């Protein structure tokens, strides 16, 4: 009963607005590929906004100050945390349900990830406007595990491709094992067809 949202090409606040409300409505959300997340406005602007965030630390003791989390997952996590009553229990019980991940971890590599089209860069930005990746923004502002995540995600792209190819091969065999059976499921298909399930 778990949403496994992909984060590739979704906008920070747009996606975080829907994840924040859905997790207040008792769902368990899992946002994988948090580094693929785009931000509107050019890169330099978006980096300047983060460096301004970095400068805000408690003067007398930065051990207590605002914790400037650097991984794209944790940047996105604080952006969802912004849109919740996190100081109260139903706001904490919400954050407990949300789970975020740089790249795609093992239980969710072998799953179909849903896409939020209400929070998607292709349909919410003009094609002419400038944008910035959360993955690159994290790396330039002090993220360490960009080099490792690229190679590990390239490895599952090779594994998943070989699998996808093996599923194309099964579909062509179902495509063949219907057309040989054309003589003996011609009665059964008809009552699918007249109810518009095969036209």
């Amino acid at each position: 009963q778990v949403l496994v949202l992909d984060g590739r090409g979704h906008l920070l606040g747009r996606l975080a607005a829907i994840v924040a409300k859905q997790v207040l409505l008792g769902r368990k959300v899992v946002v994988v590929r948090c580094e693929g997340i785009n931000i509107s406005g050019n890169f330099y602007r978006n980096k300047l906004k983060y460096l301004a965030f970095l400068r805000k630390r408690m003067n007398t003791n930065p051990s207590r100050g605002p914790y400037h989390f650097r991984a794209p997952s944790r940047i996105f996590w604080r952006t969802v945390r912004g849109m919740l009553p996190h100081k109260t229990k139903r706001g904490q019980a919400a954050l407990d349900r949300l789970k975020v991940f740089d790249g795609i971890p093992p239980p969710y590599d072998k799953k179909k990830r849903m896409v939020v089209p209400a929070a998607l860069k292709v349909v919410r930005l003009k094609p002419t406007r400038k944008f910035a990746y959360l993955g690159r923004l994290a790396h330039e502002v002090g993220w360490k595990y960009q080099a490792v995540t690229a190679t590990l995600e390239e490895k599952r792209k090779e594994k998943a491709k070989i699998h996808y190819r093996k599923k194309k091969q099964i579909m062509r065999l179902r495509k063949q094992a219907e057309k040989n059976v054309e003589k003996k499921i011609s009665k059964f298909t008809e009552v699918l067809k007249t109810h518009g399930l095969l036209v």
Binding site: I170, L173, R174, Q176, A177, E178, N180, V181, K184, I185, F188, T189, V191, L192, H195, L197
Partner: peptide, 24 residues
Amino acid sequence: DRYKVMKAKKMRNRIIKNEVKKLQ
């Protein structure tokens, strides 16, 4: 109509499940 469509799809699936495995 939903009951009749369920019963026909079931048997269509069962015979395709045979022939795809016999083709593999």
